[PDB]
Symmetry: C4
Subunit: 90 residues, 4 copies
């Protein structure tokens, strides 16, 4: 499960990285950062400058937020929880 | 269900698009983008400049966030999940 | 229930409005808008300029987000849902 | 439970405060504020300026959001709820 969500999230981020680096002309690292803060709703970034960027962002958000949060919902509950939980055992 | 939420979300976005393009004077595409990042809480945009814009945004958020997230909660769980889940079957 | 959450949310917003209008020197409407986008995590606004503003925002977020979202979780599910749901009955 | 989440959240914020104050060169209070609005997805702040800041933010978000929201989910439901709920008793 966690393995799958990880894959789906990575592919989603890869797509955003390629899109933004090409259409908005961002360096790869900035394109990945934009993709990440967008899908997690953190939004610490100015908006895309092109209409293509805006249209894609709208669609990217609706399709990717569900996935990204489903993944985060497992990263801390199915992997990060026990580590400290089972560790909460005397 | 998914069909209904889709309709309710579209109408909500249409209302925001009309509102912002008129009161804040944004081009339709920018008004739709503002509406979308606002309701998904992504917030990658500067705030409205008019008091009408601010008041409407406050009300728009409280009434639309619940709907938009309910829709997203189905777009990936009732439509996007199986596609890859049922596809996870050897 | 909905009545109570409404009260708790209003008081929370009133507190933020008073705080920001005084410490950050914002007009009441802008102080309320800042309070609202902050607690809903929309964040369509520049950050507070004073250390008092920042410290208060940190505490305001942790204490108010839970409440605000609990309220929204009822505004659309206990009030906005039926209106269109019961209306989905032929 | 609430005691534990409080500890995990504090350590997470301490790490972010140290990181941002050092790499992005922010005063401690601004580093803590950035860490807080980032992990709660409020995002009321400009993005990091360095690639290290961006890479760390990406990882910080994925690992810390789950924790921070789990904590908030208890701060208002296991501590803030009764206070006013049990108080809702005539
Ligand atoms: Na958010
Ligand atoms: Na945000
Ligand atoms: Na934001
Ligand atoms: Na923002």
């Amino acid at each position: 499960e966690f393995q799958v969500l990880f894959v789906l999230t990575i592919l989603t981020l890869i797509s955003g990285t390629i899109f933004y680096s090409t259409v908005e002309g961002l360096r790869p690292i900035d394109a990945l950062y934009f993709s990440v803060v967008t899908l997690t709703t953190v939004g610490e970034t100015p908006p895309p400058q092109t209409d293509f960027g805006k249209i894609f962002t709208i669609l990217y958000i609706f399709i990717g937020i569900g996935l990204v949060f489903g993944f985060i919902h497992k990263l801390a509950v199915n992997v990060q929880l026990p580590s400290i939980l089972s560790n909460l055992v005397p």
